[PDB]
Amino acid sequence: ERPTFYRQELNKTIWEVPERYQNLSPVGSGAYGSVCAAFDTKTGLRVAVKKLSRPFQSIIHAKRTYRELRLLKHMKHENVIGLLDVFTPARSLEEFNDVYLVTHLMGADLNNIVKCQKLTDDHVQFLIYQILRGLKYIHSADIIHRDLKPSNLAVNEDCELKILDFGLARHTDDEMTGYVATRWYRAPEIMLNWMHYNQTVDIWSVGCIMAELLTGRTLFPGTDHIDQLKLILRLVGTPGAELLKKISSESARNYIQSLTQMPKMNFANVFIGANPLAVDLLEKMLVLDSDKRITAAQALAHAYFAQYHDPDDEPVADPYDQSFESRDLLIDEWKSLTYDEVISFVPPPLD
Ligand SMILES: O=C(Nc1ccc2[nH]cc(CCc3ccncc3)c2c1)c1cc(F)cc(N2CCOCC2)c1
Secondary structure (H helix, E strand, C coil): CCCCEEEEEECCEEEEEECCEEEEEEEEECCCEEEEEEEECCCCEEEEEEEECCCCCCHHHHHHHHHHHHHHHHCCCCCECCCCEEECCCCCCCCCCCCEEEEECCCCEHHHHHHHCCCCHHHHHHHHHHHHHHHHHHHHCCCCCCCCCHHHEEECCCCCEEECCCCCCCCCCCCCCCCCHHHHCCCHHHHCCCCCCCCCHHHHHHHHHHHHHHHCCCCCCCCCHHHHHHHHHHHHCCCCHHHHHHCCCHHHHHHHHCCCCCCCCCHHHCCCCCCHHHHHHHHHHCCCCCCCCCCHHHHHCCHHHCCCCCHHHCCCCCCCCCHHHHCCCCHHHHHHHHHHHHHCCCCCCCC
16 A cells, blocks of 8 residues: 655655656755655646655754644645645654655746736736635634745636745745845734734735735835835834834834834825725735734725625634644654654545
8 A cells, every 4th residue: 555666866865756756857945845846647736746854853843844744734725735645755653754745836926927927906806815815714723824925825827826835944044134035025023023923924925915916016125124124114104102012122112213203105106006995905904013904804805805705715724733832842752743644644635
């Protein structure tokens, strides 16, 4: 019942995969993993296979591996990445050292859509509706993406959209420094570590994405953390005392207060010619105080999506047990938990 595996070297990386996966071709790599495109002869699908890099090298990495697998096994929604397969060449826990994760091959992301074609208001409605529909689902499981951006959004030729995470490297300060798309979609509270963050950090990102779909241009293309903050506060206004009290960081709070006070701008004069309903929704998403931001579930009911909104086809997630997050284990323990989840994996209905 165990499939036969075959070996192949690709860019100095050994790939051992079941025979069903053919025509492996490098797509990308980083500190956390390497990715190949392939043809799944069992399902007839073009797939992307991610091989994790040293998944159990440390406690921190071992835990991250377990977390990703748990997440991936749980997410079953049209607008979210689906796990087609997870495998290891290991025949036992003792020799278990590699984990491979398989999903549908992307190809086009939202970045190349917005860079390479004209989008009507109808397109924007459909794209953002799908992101919000996925977010409702993940947020109902108390799962937060935190790194929503055009390159993490797969879009097909019928404009159908899926949320994933193509991060293959450590989320360091260097990667977040300077004039980088890495930071342009980030909620200010997480960019400047103001406070404990809520799931509406993802709604801020959606606002930034929606704005760029409407104008074709990045909303807050800051040259660094502080330049980006100034771009944000110019649009949305400097915070009042109510928000300032919620900023737990004394240093961050003290910095914001050094800034000259500015009013919220008129969004109709920024997003010129945009559907007034799109302008209205942007104003409800691009709110500095994360307590006051519209939720995904609230947003799906906004009049901007009247064309697509169907309350009987916007599903929530099954309960997701994240007790493991608070738990301290050894590498070998995280490894055994991970091994059990590989072994217990049941493929989605064919296909
Ligand atoms: O996308 C994720 N993982 C994943 C799994 C299997 C994969 N195979 C290949 C890749 C690289 C990306 C890719 C996919 C398809 N074609 C080309 C490249 C890969 C990645 C992923 C990881 C996470 F930790 C969270 C989320 N969540 C997503 C939902 O919102 C909550 C976070 C998604």
